[model samples]
Target: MVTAALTIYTTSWCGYCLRLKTALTANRIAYDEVDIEHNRAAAEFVGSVNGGNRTVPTVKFADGSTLTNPSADEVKAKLVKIAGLEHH
Candidate 1:
Protein backbone atom coordinates (compact mmCIF):
# COMPACT_ATOMS: atom_id res chain seq x y z
CA MET A 1 0.00 0.00 0.00
CA VAL A 2 3.04 2.24 0.23
CA THR A 3 2.12 3.82 3.51
CA ALA A 4 4.62 6.21 4.98
CA ALA A 5 6.58 4.94 7.92
CA LEU A 6 5.99 8.23 9.72
CA THR A 7 3.35 10.96 9.59
CA ILE A 8 3.71 14.41 11.03
CA TYR A 9 0.66 16.53 11.91
CA THR A 10 1.47 20.16 11.49
CA THR A 11 0.35 23.77 10.87
CA SER A 12 1.69 26.56 8.72
CA TRP A 13 2.85 28.88 11.47
CA CYS A 14 4.24 26.46 14.00
CA GLY A 15 7.94 26.84 14.60
CA TYR A 16 8.19 23.54 16.37
CA CYS A 17 6.77 21.81 13.34
CA LEU A 18 9.37 23.44 11.12
CA ARG A 19 12.24 22.41 13.35
CA LEU A 20 10.91 18.91 13.61
CA LYS A 21 10.88 18.67 9.83
CA THR A 22 14.40 19.98 9.64
CA ALA A 23 15.45 17.58 12.35
CA LEU A 24 13.75 14.70 10.62
CA THR A 25 15.58 15.46 7.40
CA ALA A 26 18.82 16.03 9.29
CA ASN A 27 18.51 12.48 10.57
CA ARG A 28 17.62 11.28 7.06
CA ILE A 29 14.30 9.85 8.17
CA ALA A 30 11.41 9.98 5.71
CA TYR A 31 7.96 11.09 6.85
CA ASP A 32 4.66 12.41 5.59
CA GLU A 33 3.13 15.64 6.85
CA VAL A 34 -0.53 16.47 7.32
CA ASP A 35 -1.61 20.03 7.81
CA ILE A 36 -4.26 20.24 10.48
CA GLU A 37 -6.08 23.03 8.72
CA HIS A 38 -6.52 20.88 5.68
CA ASN A 39 -7.51 17.73 7.50
CA ARG A 40 -10.33 17.75 10.06
CA ALA A 41 -9.49 14.27 11.23
CA ALA A 42 -5.88 15.17 11.77
CA ALA A 43 -6.72 18.34 13.71
CA GLU A 44 -9.17 16.44 15.84
CA PHE A 45 -6.62 13.72 16.39
CA VAL A 46 -4.11 16.26 17.51
CA GLY A 47 -6.71 17.70 19.84
CA SER A 48 -7.63 14.29 21.15
CA VAL A 49 -4.07 13.77 22.33
CA ASN A 50 -3.43 17.34 23.48
CA GLY A 51 -6.39 17.89 25.81
CA GLY A 52 -8.68 19.14 23.04
CA ASN A 53 -6.10 21.61 21.80
CA ARG A 54 -4.95 21.68 18.19
CA THR A 55 -1.29 21.42 18.93
CA VAL A 56 1.12 20.92 16.10
CA PRO A 57 4.24 18.77 16.03
CA THR A 58 2.36 15.54 16.47
CA VAL A 59 3.68 12.47 14.66
CA LYS A 60 2.14 9.17 13.68
CA PHE A 61 3.62 5.85 12.68
CA ALA A 62 2.20 3.37 10.22
CA ASP A 63 1.27 1.08 13.09
CA GLY A 64 -0.91 3.69 14.81
CA SER A 65 1.97 4.93 16.90
CA THR A 66 1.90 8.63 17.77
CA LEU A 67 3.73 11.25 19.77
CA THR A 68 3.37 14.95 20.53
CA ASN A 69 6.29 17.34 20.34
CA PRO A 70 8.91 14.59 20.25
CA SER A 71 12.36 15.86 19.29
CA ALA A 72 14.67 14.62 16.57
CA ASP A 73 16.92 12.65 18.90
CA GLU A 74 13.99 11.01 20.61
CA VAL A 75 12.33 10.19 17.29
CA LYS A 76 15.58 8.64 16.09
CA ALA A 77 15.71 6.47 19.16
CA LYS A 78 12.09 5.53 18.64
CA LEU A 79 12.74 4.64 15.02
CA VAL A 80 15.54 2.36 16.09
CA LYS A 81 13.41 0.63 18.70
CA ILE A 82 10.52 0.23 16.29
CA ALA A 83 10.05 -2.61 13.84
CA GLY A 84 12.97 -3.26 11.49
CA LEU A 85 11.56 -6.07 9.35
CA GLU A 86 8.55 -7.54 7.59
CA HIS A 87 6.62 -4.26 7.38
CA HIS A 88 5.98 -4.29 11.09
Candidate 2:
Protein backbone atom coordinates (compact mmCIF):
# COMPACT_ATOMS: atom_id res chain seq x y z
CA MET A 1 0.00 0.00 0.00
CA VAL A 2 1.23 3.48 -0.76
CA THR A 3 1.39 6.00 2.02
CA ALA A 4 2.70 9.48 2.63
CA ALA A 5 4.45 10.77 5.72
CA LEU A 6 2.46 13.52 7.36
CA THR A 7 3.43 16.15 9.87
CA ILE A 8 0.84 18.10 11.81
CA TYR A 9 1.70 21.34 13.60
CA THR A 10 -0.43 22.15 16.60
CA THR A 11 -0.62 23.90 19.96
CA SER A 12 -1.56 22.33 23.26
CA TRP A 13 -4.60 24.48 23.85
CA CYS A 14 -6.08 24.53 20.37
CA GLY A 15 -9.43 22.74 20.24
CA TYR A 16 -9.37 22.39 16.46
CA CYS A 17 -5.99 20.74 16.75
CA LEU A 18 -7.40 18.26 19.20
CA ARG A 19 -10.38 17.61 16.95
CA LEU A 20 -8.21 17.04 13.91
CA LYS A 21 -6.10 14.59 15.87
CA THR A 22 -9.14 12.66 16.96
CA ALA A 23 -10.37 12.54 13.39
CA LEU A 24 -7.06 11.29 12.10
CA THR A 25 -6.84 8.65 14.80
CA ALA A 26 -10.38 7.53 14.22
CA ASN A 27 -9.69 7.25 10.51
CA ARG A 28 -6.58 5.15 11.12
CA ILE A 29 -4.27 7.82 9.73
CA ALA A 30 -0.69 7.89 10.91
CA TYR A 31 1.09 11.19 11.40
CA ASP A 32 3.72 13.00 13.39
CA GLU A 33 2.40 15.68 15.67
CA VAL A 34 4.45 18.70 16.66
CA ASP A 35 3.62 21.11 19.43
CA ILE A 36 4.63 24.54 18.19
CA GLU A 37 4.38 25.98 21.66
CA HIS A 38 7.71 24.36 22.49
CA ASN A 39 9.40 24.11 19.10
CA ARG A 40 10.44 27.48 17.67
CA ALA A 41 11.19 26.11 14.23
CA ALA A 42 7.91 24.25 14.03
CA ALA A 43 6.12 27.39 15.17
CA GLU A 44 7.79 29.39 12.44
CA PHE A 45 6.82 26.80 9.86
CA VAL A 46 3.24 26.99 10.93
CA GLY A 47 3.36 30.76 10.72
CA SER A 48 4.75 30.54 7.23
CA VAL A 49 1.88 28.34 6.11
CA ASN A 50 -0.69 30.62 7.70
CA GLY A 51 0.63 33.89 6.30
CA GLY A 52 2.47 34.89 9.49
CA ASN A 53 -0.26 33.72 11.81
CA ARG A 54 0.36 30.71 14.01
CA THR A 55 -2.49 28.53 12.89
CA VAL A 56 -3.07 25.21 14.51
CA PRO A 57 -3.68 22.07 12.44
CA THR A 58 -1.22 23.07 9.74
CA VAL A 59 -0.32 19.86 7.97
CA LYS A 60 2.72 19.04 5.87
CA PHE A 61 2.76 16.15 3.43
CA ALA A 62 5.67 14.06 2.21
CA ASP A 63 5.53 15.82 -1.17
CA GLY A 64 6.37 19.15 0.48
CA SER A 65 2.78 20.29 0.13
CA THR A 66 0.82 21.81 3.00
CA LEU A 67 -2.73 22.40 4.16
CA THR A 68 -3.92 24.81 6.77
CA ASN A 69 -6.82 23.76 9.01
CA PRO A 70 -8.12 21.11 6.66
CA SER A 71 -11.01 18.86 7.51
CA ALA A 72 -10.59 15.14 8.07
CA ASP A 73 -12.21 14.29 4.76
CA GLU A 74 -9.88 16.70 3.00
CA VAL A 75 -6.91 14.97 4.56
CA LYS A 76 -8.17 11.59 3.40
CA ALA A 77 -8.69 12.89 -0.11
CA LYS A 78 -5.17 14.26 -0.21
CA LEU A 79 -3.80 10.98 1.03
CA VAL A 80 -5.63 9.13 -1.71
CA LYS A 81 -4.25 11.49 -4.30
CA ILE A 82 -0.75 11.27 -2.88
CA ALA A 83 -0.86 7.50 -2.95
CA GLY A 84 -2.00 7.52 -6.56
CA LEU A 85 -5.02 5.48 -5.58
CA GLU A 86 -7.22 7.46 -7.89
CA HIS A 87 -5.43 5.88 -10.83
CA HIS A 88 -5.86 2.36 -9.60
Candidate 3:
Protein backbone atom coordinates (compact mmCIF):
# COMPACT_ATOMS: atom_id res chain seq x y z
CA MET A 1 0.00 0.00 0.00
CA VAL A 2 1.10 3.52 -0.69
CA THR A 3 1.21 5.47 2.51
CA ALA A 4 1.00 9.21 2.13
CA ALA A 5 3.80 11.08 3.81
CA LEU A 6 1.86 14.30 3.27
CA THR A 7 -1.41 15.02 1.49
CA ILE A 8 -3.05 18.29 0.45
CA TYR A 9 -6.69 18.57 -0.60
CA THR A 10 -7.39 21.25 -3.16
CA THR A 11 -9.48 22.07 -6.19
CA SER A 12 -8.09 23.18 -9.56
CA TRP A 13 -9.72 26.59 -9.59
CA CYS A 14 -8.74 27.73 -6.14
CA GLY A 15 -6.16 30.48 -6.35
CA TYR A 16 -5.03 30.00 -2.78
CA CYS A 17 -4.56 26.33 -3.46
CA LEU A 18 -2.34 27.14 -6.40
CA ARG A 19 -0.34 29.48 -4.23
CA LEU A 20 0.07 26.79 -1.61
CA LYS A 21 1.33 24.37 -4.24
CA THR A 22 3.85 26.86 -5.50
CA ALA A 23 5.18 27.55 -2.02
CA LEU A 24 5.48 23.87 -1.22
CA THR A 25 7.37 23.16 -4.43
CA ALA A 26 9.65 26.13 -3.86
CA ASN A 27 10.45 24.68 -0.44
CA ARG A 28 11.08 21.22 -1.90
CA ILE A 29 8.40 19.54 0.19
CA ALA A 30 6.86 16.71 -1.77
CA TYR A 31 3.19 16.12 -1.07
CA ASP A 32 0.10 14.46 -2.52
CA GLU A 33 -2.89 16.56 -3.50
CA VAL A 34 -6.46 15.28 -3.57
CA ASP A 35 -9.05 17.03 -5.68
CA ILE A 36 -12.22 16.57 -3.68
CA GLU A 37 -14.45 17.05 -6.70
CA HIS A 38 -12.81 14.42 -8.93
CA ASN A 39 -12.53 11.36 -6.73
CA ARG A 40 -15.38 10.15 -4.52
CA ALA A 41 -13.00 8.42 -2.17
CA ALA A 42 -11.02 11.58 -1.85
CA ALA A 43 -14.15 13.60 -1.22
CA GLU A 44 -15.15 11.28 1.54
CA PHE A 45 -11.68 11.39 2.93
CA VAL A 46 -11.88 15.15 3.08
CA GLY A 47 -15.24 14.99 4.78
CA SER A 48 -13.88 12.69 7.44
CA VAL A 49 -10.97 14.96 8.06
CA ASN A 50 -13.17 17.99 8.55
CA GLY A 51 -15.84 16.36 10.72
CA GLY A 52 -18.31 16.26 7.82
CA ASN A 53 -17.53 19.72 6.52
CA ARG A 54 -16.44 20.05 2.88
CA THR A 55 -13.55 22.35 3.44
CA VAL A 56 -10.92 22.67 0.75
CA PRO A 57 -7.19 22.92 1.28
CA THR A 58 -7.24 20.25 3.94
CA VAL A 59 -3.70 19.15 4.62
CA LYS A 60 -2.89 15.75 6.09
CA PHE A 61 0.47 14.99 7.57
CA ALA A 62 2.25 11.69 8.14
CA ASP A 63 1.76 11.89 11.86
CA GLY A 64 -2.04 11.77 11.39
CA SER A 65 -2.43 15.47 12.17
CA THR A 66 -4.45 17.70 9.87
CA LEU A 67 -4.99 21.37 9.07
CA THR A 68 -7.95 22.82 7.23
CA ASN A 69 -8.06 26.10 5.32
CA PRO A 70 -4.48 26.91 6.21
CA SER A 71 -2.52 29.76 4.72
CA ALA A 72 0.43 29.03 2.42
CA ASP A 73 2.94 30.09 5.06
CA GLU A 74 1.23 27.95 7.69
CA VAL A 75 1.38 24.79 5.63
CA LYS A 76 4.87 25.58 4.48
CA ALA A 77 6.06 25.95 8.03
CA LYS A 78 4.53 22.61 8.93
CA LEU A 79 6.20 21.03 5.91
CA VAL A 80 9.57 22.42 6.95
CA LYS A 81 9.24 20.99 10.44
CA ILE A 82 8.11 17.67 9.06
CA ALA A 83 11.12 17.54 6.74
CA GLY A 84 13.34 18.02 9.75
CA LEU A 85 11.52 15.15 11.51
CA GLU A 86 10.45 17.52 14.23
CA HIS A 87 7.00 17.93 15.73
CA HIS A 88 5.29 21.29 15.86
Candidate 4:
Protein backbone atom coordinates (compact mmCIF):
# COMPACT_ATOMS: atom_id res chain seq x y z
CA MET A 1 0.00 0.00 0.00
CA VAL A 2 1.11 3.57 -0.62
CA THR A 3 1.73 5.86 2.30
CA ALA A 4 -0.56 8.82 2.57
CA ALA A 5 0.84 12.31 2.90
CA LEU A 6 -2.20 13.84 4.56
CA THR A 7 -5.15 12.91 6.76
CA ILE A 8 -8.61 13.98 5.63
CA TYR A 9 -11.40 14.38 8.20
CA THR A 10 -14.94 13.80 7.04
CA THR A 11 -18.54 12.92 7.84
CA SER A 12 -20.42 10.30 5.79
CA TRP A 13 -23.00 12.65 4.36
CA CYS A 14 -20.64 15.32 3.15
CA GLY A 15 -20.85 15.83 -0.60
CA TYR A 16 -17.90 18.15 -0.60
CA CYS A 17 -15.81 15.49 1.08
CA LEU A 18 -16.94 13.03 -1.59
CA ARG A 19 -15.97 15.45 -4.30
CA LEU A 20 -12.56 16.03 -2.82
CA LYS A 21 -11.96 12.29 -2.52
CA THR A 22 -12.87 11.75 -6.15
CA ALA A 23 -10.65 14.64 -7.19
CA LEU A 24 -7.68 13.33 -5.20
CA THR A 25 -8.06 10.01 -6.96
CA ALA A 26 -7.79 11.73 -10.34
CA ASN A 27 -4.88 13.86 -9.14
CA ARG A 28 -2.96 10.74 -8.07
CA ILE A 29 -2.50 11.96 -4.51
CA ALA A 30 -2.59 9.40 -1.76
CA TYR A 31 -4.41 10.33 1.41
CA ASP A 32 -5.65 8.88 4.67
CA GLU A 33 -9.19 9.52 5.88
CA VAL A 34 -11.15 9.56 9.14
CA ASP A 35 -14.85 9.66 9.86
CA ILE A 36 -15.73 12.13 12.55
CA GLU A 37 -19.01 10.34 13.07
CA HIS A 38 -17.24 7.13 14.07
CA ASN A 39 -14.16 8.42 15.81
CA ARG A 40 -14.38 10.61 18.91
CA ALA A 41 -10.83 11.85 18.64
CA ALA A 42 -11.37 12.50 14.96
CA ALA A 43 -14.27 14.83 15.69
CA GLU A 44 -12.18 16.64 18.27
CA PHE A 45 -9.40 16.92 15.73
CA VAL A 46 -11.77 18.30 13.14
CA GLY A 47 -13.13 20.83 15.61
CA SER A 48 -9.65 21.94 16.65
CA VAL A 49 -8.66 22.54 13.06
CA ASN A 50 -11.84 24.37 12.18
CA GLY A 51 -12.27 26.57 15.26
CA GLY A 52 -15.03 24.27 16.61
CA ASN A 53 -16.88 24.11 13.31
CA ARG A 54 -16.47 20.35 12.68
CA THR A 55 -15.78 21.02 9.08
CA VAL A 56 -15.76 18.03 6.76
CA PRO A 57 -12.71 17.47 4.51
CA THR A 58 -10.39 19.19 6.96
CA VAL A 59 -6.93 18.08 5.99
CA LYS A 60 -4.02 17.56 8.37
CA PHE A 61 -0.57 17.41 6.87
CA ALA A 62 2.49 15.61 8.19
CA ASP A 63 3.83 18.48 10.34
CA GLY A 64 0.34 19.10 11.80
CA SER A 65 -0.43 21.91 9.39
CA THR A 66 -4.12 21.99 8.39
CA LEU A 67 -6.29 22.89 5.44
CA THR A 68 -9.96 23.41 6.27
CA ASN A 69 -12.18 22.29 3.41
CA PRO A 70 -9.50 22.89 0.84
CA SER A 71 -10.04 22.32 -2.87
CA ALA A 72 -8.22 19.46 -4.64
CA ASP A 73 -5.91 21.84 -6.49
CA GLU A 74 -5.04 23.55 -3.23
CA VAL A 75 -4.04 20.24 -1.67
CA LYS A 76 -1.97 19.34 -4.75
CA ALA A 77 -0.16 22.67 -4.58
CA LYS A 78 0.61 22.21 -0.90
CA LEU A 79 1.92 18.70 -1.45
CA VAL A 80 4.91 19.80 -3.58
CA LYS A 81 5.35 22.70 -1.21
CA ILE A 82 6.02 19.96 1.35
CA ALA A 83 8.46 18.71 -1.32
CA GLY A 84 10.05 15.63 -3.07
CA LEU A 85 10.99 12.03 -2.13
CA GLU A 86 11.29 12.72 1.57
CA HIS A 87 7.48 12.76 1.64
CA HIS A 88 7.07 9.54 -0.31
Candidate 5:
Protein backbone atom coordinates (compact mmCIF):
# COMPACT_ATOMS: atom_id res chain seq x y z
CA MET A 1 0.00 0.00 0.00
CA VAL A 2 1.43 3.33 -1.02
CA THR A 3 0.91 6.12 1.49
CA ALA A 4 -0.12 9.37 -0.13
CA ALA A 5 -0.79 12.99 0.72
CA LEU A 6 -3.00 13.24 -2.36
CA THR A 7 -5.98 11.14 -3.38
CA ILE A 8 -6.29 10.94 -7.17
CA TYR A 9 -9.64 10.02 -8.69
CA THR A 10 -9.28 8.39 -12.07
CA THR A 11 -10.46 5.90 -14.65
CA SER A 12 -8.70 3.33 -16.82
CA TRP A 13 -9.01 4.97 -20.22
CA CYS A 14 -8.09 8.57 -19.58
CA GLY A 15 -4.71 9.48 -21.01
CA TYR A 16 -4.34 12.51 -18.80
CA CYS A 17 -5.03 10.36 -15.77
CA LEU A 18 -2.19 8.03 -16.66
CA ARG A 19 0.06 10.93 -17.57
CA LEU A 20 -0.43 12.67 -14.25
CA LYS A 21 0.16 9.45 -12.35
CA THR A 22 3.34 8.74 -14.24
CA ALA A 23 4.55 12.28 -13.77
CA LEU A 24 3.87 12.26 -10.05
CA THR A 25 5.57 8.91 -9.66
CA ALA A 26 8.62 10.07 -11.58
CA ASN A 27 8.80 13.11 -9.35
CA ARG A 28 8.64 10.93 -6.19
CA ILE A 29 5.31 12.31 -5.09
CA ALA A 30 3.17 9.82 -3.20
CA TYR A 31 -0.46 9.57 -4.27
CA ASP A 32 -3.36 7.21 -3.65
CA GLU A 33 -5.18 6.39 -6.86
CA VAL A 34 -8.86 5.51 -7.05
CA ASP A 35 -10.26 3.92 -10.18
CA ILE A 36 -13.74 5.43 -10.31
CA GLU A 37 -14.93 2.89 -12.85
CA HIS A 38 -15.00 0.33 -10.08
CA ASN A 39 -15.82 2.64 -7.22
CA ARG A 40 -19.31 4.12 -7.33
CA ALA A 41 -18.78 6.34 -4.32
CA ALA A 42 -15.65 7.74 -5.82
CA ALA A 43 -17.42 8.47 -9.07
CA GLU A 44 -20.17 10.30 -7.24
CA PHE A 45 -17.71 12.30 -5.21
CA VAL A 46 -15.81 13.26 -8.32
CA GLY A 47 -19.08 14.26 -10.00
CA SER A 48 -20.01 16.39 -7.00
CA VAL A 49 -16.95 18.52 -7.45
CA ASN A 50 -17.02 18.47 -11.23
CA GLY A 51 -20.56 19.75 -11.70
CA GLY A 52 -22.00 16.25 -12.23
CA ASN A 53 -19.37 15.16 -14.68
CA ARG A 54 -17.08 12.26 -13.94
CA THR A 55 -13.86 14.01 -14.70
CA VAL A 56 -10.78 11.87 -14.36
CA PRO A 57 -7.61 12.89 -12.55
CA THR A 58 -9.45 14.87 -9.92
CA VAL A 59 -6.82 15.33 -7.28
CA LYS A 60 -7.85 15.72 -3.67
CA PHE A 61 -5.22 17.19 -1.40
CA ALA A 62 -4.59 16.76 2.30
CA ASP A 63 -5.76 20.31 2.89
CA GLY A 64 -9.27 19.51 1.57
CA SER A 65 -8.64 21.27 -1.72
CA THR A 66 -9.03 19.76 -5.19
CA LEU A 67 -7.67 20.14 -8.71
CA THR A 68 -9.19 18.69 -11.85
CA ASN A 69 -6.82 17.48 -14.53
CA PRO A 70 -3.93 19.41 -13.12
CA SER A 71 -0.56 19.55 -14.81
CA ALA A 72 2.56 18.12 -13.19
CA ASP A 73 3.75 21.54 -12.08
CA GLU A 74 0.41 22.27 -10.43
CA VAL A 75 0.51 18.98 -8.61
CA LYS A 76 4.09 19.56 -7.46
CA ALA A 77 3.33 23.05 -6.20
CA LYS A 78 0.30 21.84 -4.24
CA LEU A 79 2.25 18.98 -2.74
CA VAL A 80 4.94 21.34 -1.56
CA LYS A 81 2.41 23.71 -0.03
CA ILE A 82 -0.06 21.23 1.46
CA ALA A 83 2.12 18.27 2.30
CA GLY A 84 5.35 20.13 3.01
CA LEU A 85 7.17 17.98 0.48
CA GLU A 86 9.96 19.41 -1.63
CA HIS A 87 9.51 19.60 -5.39
CA HIS A 88 12.24 18.17 -7.58
Candidate 6:
Protein backbone atom coordinates (compact mmCIF):
# COMPACT_ATOMS: atom_id res chain seq x y z
CA MET A 1 0.00 0.00 0.00
CA VAL A 2 1.16 3.51 -0.74
CA THR A 3 1.88 5.81 2.18
CA ALA A 4 -0.59 8.63 2.50
CA ALA A 5 0.00 11.77 4.46
CA LEU A 6 -2.50 13.93 6.31
CA THR A 7 -1.78 17.58 6.92
CA ILE A 8 -3.62 19.65 9.47
CA TYR A 9 -3.23 23.41 9.74
CA THR A 10 -4.02 24.38 13.30
CA THR A 11 -3.76 27.12 15.89
CA SER A 12 -3.23 27.14 19.60
CA TRP A 13 -6.28 26.97 21.89
CA CYS A 14 -8.52 25.56 19.17
CA GLY A 15 -10.72 22.81 20.52
CA TYR A 16 -11.41 21.44 17.09
CA CYS A 17 -7.71 21.12 16.49
CA LEU A 18 -7.29 19.15 19.66
CA ARG A 19 -10.15 16.88 18.75
CA LEU A 20 -8.79 16.27 15.29
CA LYS A 21 -5.35 15.56 16.71
CA THR A 22 -6.80 12.99 19.07
CA ALA A 23 -8.62 11.24 16.28
CA LEU A 24 -5.58 11.11 14.03
CA THR A 25 -3.43 9.76 16.84
CA ALA A 26 -6.07 7.22 17.80
CA ASN A 27 -6.19 5.93 14.27
CA ARG A 28 -2.39 5.48 14.25
CA ILE A 29 -1.99 7.76 11.26
CA ALA A 30 1.08 9.94 11.23
CA TYR A 31 0.36 13.50 10.15
CA ASP A 32 2.00 16.84 9.68
CA GLU A 33 0.79 19.54 12.05
CA VAL A 34 1.29 23.16 11.29
CA ASP A 35 0.70 25.84 13.89
CA ILE A 36 -0.62 28.81 11.97
CA GLU A 37 -0.22 31.16 14.89
CA HIS A 38 3.54 30.74 14.79
CA ASN A 39 4.16 30.08 11.12
CA ARG A 40 3.43 32.97 8.78
CA ALA A 41 3.83 30.99 5.56
CA ALA A 42 1.69 28.14 6.82
CA ALA A 43 -0.95 30.62 7.97
CA GLU A 44 -0.92 32.20 4.54
CA PHE A 45 -1.28 28.84 2.89
CA VAL A 46 -4.20 27.89 5.09
CA GLY A 47 -5.93 31.18 4.44
CA SER A 48 -5.32 30.89 0.72
CA VAL A 49 -7.01 27.52 0.71
CA ASN A 50 -9.97 28.56 2.86
CA GLY A 51 -10.74 32.03 1.49
CA GLY A 52 -9.11 33.86 4.41
CA ASN A 53 -10.91 31.89 7.06
CA ARG A 54 -8.13 30.84 9.44
CA THR A 55 -10.30 28.34 11.13
CA VAL A 56 -8.71 25.69 13.27
CA PRO A 57 -8.28 22.17 12.00
CA THR A 58 -8.06 22.81 8.29
CA VAL A 59 -7.13 19.59 6.51
CA LYS A 60 -5.22 18.66 3.37
CA PHE A 61 -5.23 15.20 1.90
CA ALA A 62 -2.40 13.48 0.07
CA ASP A 63 -4.16 14.06 -3.27
CA GLY A 64 -4.13 17.85 -2.68
CA SER A 65 -7.83 18.14 -1.83
CA THR A 66 -8.42 20.59 0.98
CA LEU A 67 -11.10 20.67 3.64
CA THR A 68 -11.95 23.66 5.83
CA ASN A 69 -12.97 23.30 9.47
CA PRO A 70 -13.50 19.58 9.20
CA SER A 71 -14.21 17.33 12.16
CA ALA A 72 -11.82 14.51 13.04
CA ASP A 73 -14.17 11.78 11.94
CA GLU A 74 -14.91 13.62 8.73
CA VAL A 75 -11.23 13.83 7.95
CA LYS A 76 -10.75 10.15 8.71
CA ALA A 77 -13.58 9.19 6.38
CA LYS A 78 -12.20 11.29 3.56
CA LEU A 79 -8.73 9.83 4.07
CA VAL A 80 -10.09 6.31 3.91
CA LYS A 81 -11.97 7.03 0.70
CA ILE A 82 -8.86 8.59 -0.78
CA ALA A 83 -6.95 5.36 -0.25
CA GLY A 84 -9.69 3.53 -2.14
CA LEU A 85 -10.97 1.81 0.97
CA GLU A 86 -14.32 1.97 2.73
CA HIS A 87 -14.45 3.61 6.15
CA HIS A 88 -14.42 1.06 8.93
RMSD of 3: 3.9
lDDT of 4 by residue, 1-88 (tens): 2256888898888778888888899998889998887998988878888746775568887657888988879988887667565554
| lDDT of prediction 2 | 0.80
Error of 3 at 3 (Å): 7.2
Indicate whether candidate 1 or candidate 3 has the larger TM-score: 1
- Winner on lDDT between 3 and 6 is 6
**TM-score of candidate 4 versus the correct structure, residues matched by position:** 0.81
Candidate 3 lDDT, 1-88, residue by residue in tens: 2256578876787656887777778767668877878987777777777636675678888766888767667776776665564654
Which tens-of-lDDT digit does each residue in 1-88 have in candidate 2? 3344678888888879888888888889878877887999988888889746885568888777899988878888887777665873
Please give the range of 10 consecutive residues that has the lowest summed lDDT in model 4.
79-88
Q: C-alpha displacement of 29 in model 3, angstroms?
A: 1.3
Q: Ten consecutive residues with minimal summed lDDT in candidate 2? A: 1-10
Full candidate order by TM-score, most accurate first: 2, 1, 4, 5, 6, 3
- Evaluate residue 1 in candidate 5 and report its C-alpha lDDT on the 0 to 100 scale: 19
* Model 1 bad stretches (over 4 Å): 1-3, 85-88
Q: Which stretches of candidate 4 lie over 4 Å from their true place?
A: 85-88
> Candidate 4 at residue 30, lDDT?
83
**Which lDDT values do the candidates have, in the order given?**
0.77, 0.80, 0.72, 0.81, 0.78, 0.75
List the candidates ranked by lDDT, beginning with the highest: 4, 2, 5, 1, 6, 3
Query: How much is the lDDT of residue 79 in candidate 1?
Result: 64
Q: Choose 2 or 3, whichever is better by lDDT.
A: 2
**Clashing residue pairs in candidate 6 (N, C-alpha, C atoms within 3 angstroms):** none
TM-score, per-candidate, Cα-based = 0.82, 0.83, 0.65, 0.81, 0.79, 0.70
